[PDB]
Amino acid sequence: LLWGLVFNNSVPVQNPKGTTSKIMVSVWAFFAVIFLASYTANLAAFMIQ
Amino acid sequence: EEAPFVIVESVDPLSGTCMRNTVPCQKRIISENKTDEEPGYIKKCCKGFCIDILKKISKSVKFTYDLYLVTNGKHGKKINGTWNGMIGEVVMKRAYMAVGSLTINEERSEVVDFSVPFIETGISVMVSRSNGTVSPSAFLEPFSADVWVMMFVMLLIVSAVAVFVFEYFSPGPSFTIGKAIWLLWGLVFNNSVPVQNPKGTTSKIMVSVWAFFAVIFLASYTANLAAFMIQEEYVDQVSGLSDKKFQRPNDFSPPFRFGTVPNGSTERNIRNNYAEMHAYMGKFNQRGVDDALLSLKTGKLDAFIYDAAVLNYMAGRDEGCKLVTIGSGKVFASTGYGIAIQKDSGWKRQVDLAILQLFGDGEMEELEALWLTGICHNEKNEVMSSQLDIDNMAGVFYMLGAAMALSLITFICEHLFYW
Amino acid sequence: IVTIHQEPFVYVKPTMSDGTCKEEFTVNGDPVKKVICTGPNDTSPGSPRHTVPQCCYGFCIDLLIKLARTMQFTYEVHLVADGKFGTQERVQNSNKKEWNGMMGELLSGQADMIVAPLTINNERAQYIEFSKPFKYQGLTILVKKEIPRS
Amino acid sequence: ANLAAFLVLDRPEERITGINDPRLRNPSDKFIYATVKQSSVDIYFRRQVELSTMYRHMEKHNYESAAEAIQAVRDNKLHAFIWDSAVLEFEASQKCDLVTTGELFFRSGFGIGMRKDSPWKQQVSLSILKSHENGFMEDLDKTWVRYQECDSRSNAPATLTFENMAGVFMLVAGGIVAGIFLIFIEIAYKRHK
Amino acid sequence: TLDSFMQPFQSTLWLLVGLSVHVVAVMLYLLDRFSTLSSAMWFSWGVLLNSGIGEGAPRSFSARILGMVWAGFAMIIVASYTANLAAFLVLDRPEERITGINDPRLRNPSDKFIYATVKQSSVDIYFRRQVE
Numbered sequence A: 001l002l003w004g005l006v007f008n009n010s011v012p013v014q015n016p017k018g019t020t021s022k023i024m025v026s027v028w029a030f031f032a033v034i035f036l037a038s039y040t041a042n043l044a045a046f047m048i049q
Numbered sequence B: 001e002e003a004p005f006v007i008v009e010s011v012d013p014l015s016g017t018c019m020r021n022t023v024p025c026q027k028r029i030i031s032e033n034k035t036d037e038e039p040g041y042i043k044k045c046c047k048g049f050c051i052d053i054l055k056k057i058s059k060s061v062k063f064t065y066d067l068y069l070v071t072n073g074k075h076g077k078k079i080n081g082t083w084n085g086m087i088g089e090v091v092m093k094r095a096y097m098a099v100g101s102l103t104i105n106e107e108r109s110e111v112v113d114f115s116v117p118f119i120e121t122g123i124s125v126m127v128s129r130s131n132g133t134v135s136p137s138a139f140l141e142p143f144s145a146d147v148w149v150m151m152f153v154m155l156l157i158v159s160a161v162a163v164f165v166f167e168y169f170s171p172g173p174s175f176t177i178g179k180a181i182w183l184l185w186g187l188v189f190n191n192s193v194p195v196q197n198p199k200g201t202t203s204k205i206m207v208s209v210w211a212f213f214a215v216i217f218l219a220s221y222t223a224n225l226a227a228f229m230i231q232e233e234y235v236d237q238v239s240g241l242s243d244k245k246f247q248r249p250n251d252f253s254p255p256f257r258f259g260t261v262p263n264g265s266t267e268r269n270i271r272n273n274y275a276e277m278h279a280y281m282g283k284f285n286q287r288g289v290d291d292a293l294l295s296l297k298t299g300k301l302d303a304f305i306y307d308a309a310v311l312n313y314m315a316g317r318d319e320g321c322k323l324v325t326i327g328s329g330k331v332f333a334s335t336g337y338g339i340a341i342q343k344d345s346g347w348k349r350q351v352d353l354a355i356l357q358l359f360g361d362g363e364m365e366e367l368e369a370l371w372l373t374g375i376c377h378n379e380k381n382e383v384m385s386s387q388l389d390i391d392n393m394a395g396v397f398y399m400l401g402a403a404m405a406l407s408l409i410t411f412i413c414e415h416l417f418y419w
Numbered sequence C: 001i002v003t004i005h006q007e008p009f010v011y012v013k014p015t016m017s018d019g020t021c022k023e024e025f026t027v028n029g030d031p032v033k034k035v036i037c038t039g040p041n042d043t044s045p046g047s048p049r050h051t052v053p054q055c056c057y058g059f060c061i062d063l064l065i066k067l068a069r070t071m072q073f074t075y076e077v078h079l080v081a082d083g084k085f086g087t088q089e090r091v092q093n094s095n096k097k098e099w100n101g102m103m104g105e106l107l108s109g110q111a112d113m114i115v116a117p118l119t120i121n122n123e124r125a126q127y128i129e130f131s132k133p134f135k136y137q138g139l140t141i142l143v144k145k146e147i148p149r150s
Numbered sequence D: 001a002n003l004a005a006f007l008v009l010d011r012p013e014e015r016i017t018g019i020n021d022p023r024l025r026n027p028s029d030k031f032i033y034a035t036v037k038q039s040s041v042d043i044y045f046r047r048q049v050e051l052s053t054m055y056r057h058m059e060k061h062n063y064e065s066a067a068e069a070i071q072a073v074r075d076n077k078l079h080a081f082i083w084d085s086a087v088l089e090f091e092a093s094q095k096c097d098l099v100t101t102g103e104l105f106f107r108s109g110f111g112i113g114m115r116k117d118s119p120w121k122q123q124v125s126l127s128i129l130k131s132h133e134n135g136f137m138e139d140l141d142k143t144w145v146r147y148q149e150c151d152s153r154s155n156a157p158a159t160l161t162f163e164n165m166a167g168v169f170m171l172v173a174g175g176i177v178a179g180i181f182l183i184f185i186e187i188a189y190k191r192h193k
Numbered sequence E: 001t002l003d004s005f006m007q008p009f010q011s012t013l014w015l016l017v018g019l020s021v022h023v024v025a026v027m028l029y030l031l032d033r034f035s036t037l038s039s040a041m042w043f044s045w046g047v048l049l050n051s052g053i054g055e056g057a058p059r060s061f062s063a064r065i066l067g068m069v070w071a072g073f074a075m076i077i078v079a080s081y082t083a084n085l086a087a088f089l090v091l092d093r094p095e096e097r098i099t100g101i102n103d104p105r106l107r108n109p110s111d112k113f114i115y116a117t118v119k120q121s122s123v124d125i126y127f128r129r130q131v132e
């Protein structure tokens, strides 16, 4: 589950049950969207030089 | 003594002389006690763009010159019929030439012969730069309404015909058109609105191409959104000295105040044409360029009328960048400076020929680059470090407002249709 | 008075078949004022050496009409044959030096005034008198837009 | 990341800027420029000895009139045309395929010519000085010089048009003609199995 | 570059986007019920967090219309947020330092910009021979 969310997504996965698990998954998804917006800021510059 | 066309420096602290590229000026003070007499004999040194022009003239017309400062008036106005000041000093035979920032109008040209102009000059209002808002509904800017409606009709057509015939031809409830519209909206929107996937090879084949189009659509869309969510359009306060805001200040919510320095060419030019404007300006008359500039900066004034060249120079060479001239370089009654020569003289032709030769030589450009360039004269630097305020996002919130209104009306519509 | 063709200042449109300029209104709503000229033919005086009445109007013509109204004189405007602004040919081949074009026509006694975009400099002001500038300007360069199709 | 990079920040920095720019200093045969023969710009252009060689290039080709020069630069023949500020500005305003670039130099207005001695020369000066601060010249300039046909080149962020939208629309619409073929072959395979 | 990750967006914007999710969730739940509640709240939270939680979608018509545009609103928000944080993470630096000897800063020296050299040396001699 945690690999797909960080990777941008779509690898089919089965979601857990329980409020605490979903609460943690929400923060992990926030970290994932943070991670992948910084990552793709200047990739074109690093793939050219 | 004024803007750096001509400037006066005091005596050297210990040398008792004046440095290179400098000519000594005489100043006479008569503001002391009138007991016996005091002809204020003081010697300072003059320097500037205009004294370089005088030097270049006198280095080719072959004469020598003494300098002397006027102590009667700034530039000279007709008070009771006696011209007093620089024009008065020229017409009273006490001197011959007048060099500096003298303007060419009808009266002085009628009383004193003028040479060809060597610089541009005119009337221009200078105001403090005001803040500008961002254009709402900018979220739809990096697109065209044409391609918007094209995406609409394309989605509708392809979804309906393709997926309908694909689900009906090839062998959970049956595939309703509601599922068809719901699925295709999520894929284009980047995703996650939960949806139930169809069955059949042709439907998945079409969904693959639609997902490719969706990923295409949203990578072009998010290419320069930051640039479109930042740019703001400024607005000019007034078009010029022709709108109702300047000509008729009586019918105005809290009154717009403007004024200028009296006893000058612009004052007479305004008094001759605009009566009520000058009558209103009489209350807010300033007493100097520096005092008026600081009063306009602090907020006590919102429009200043003066000569265009010196205002442009002050806007360029200013601490930081706070104020700017209106119209971005507009000039009303575009006149020029010059050199006053006594009536019925002979040096006028030689002076004009020397000035035209200096023009044809190109030295004027070098002198301007040396004495007329400004720092803030360059265009504004790149705009960065934005904050993304509530304006551009409320522009999008309006969509949720309209959608909630539509939902509210459709609810009661369906409730009435049920009965 | 002699004038020269210039894109923004003076226009030269052919007159109507009757002999009068086709009165055409402007965008502001005022009738455009036009004067009839006596200009050379289509190309030059070289092969078709013949003058033809044409129609003239523009900024210089309006200023000319304003002056003629304010100081009450009359005029008969006609174009210049050489079609050149003016230059002082001082070639030592013919042992003589003289001006050509508009200034050559003015100095020779053909005309009395020049109402046209005539500049001001040393050589021209040496021989004739120049009035106060009626518009300030400069020298610039004109190119074609690249229209980037990257 | 790469498709946005070619969709933004791609344009020439600027055109020729200065009069002393090295391209005009050393004129080659690829970069062509000229002016109108027998005129003041050529006189001032032949008095600058420091660019005398450039005048040689200017001596190569000189047109007969400014209209011929604009017609030449119009049809991709001449690259740069040096002329007056007002005429070129009005041409760029009306004719919307050309752009004036550079800073002004050798500034000299237009004056009415006249004879060596005449009373008309004495009072036309006062008449123009009176008629220029009475709103007449500004009105004439707004009437005959101020048309403003095209818009401007305000900023760098440029919107999109129906250029690639047609391509992506064709790419989308292409799918169904193959989908119907695949559906027919699927029915054929279901018949055989 | 600031040491934070909430910098590209104002605080009031954060408060508004935090209230909007709750408002739309309550509206969706009420409309779908009176024409599933906790499920609607998870749906409204997951469509914004882009996470895979959220079991089912609403069956009401107007609720579907509202969710359809709420999803696009959340995506526009996420896209704008991603666009601004890269913009301050690249292309932010001074153009260049003083370049020329005749640069206007040295031409008109103020009290804020200070510069000096070694006394009794050749640079000062050549620096006092330039009368300009």
Ligand SMILES: N[C@@H](CCC(=O)O)C(=O)O
Residues within 6 Å of the ligand: B075, B101, B102, B103, B263, B264, B265, B266, B267, B305, B306, B307
């Ligand atoms: N240059 C003006 C004085 C300054 C002004 O009035 O703006 C004059 O000679 O009268």
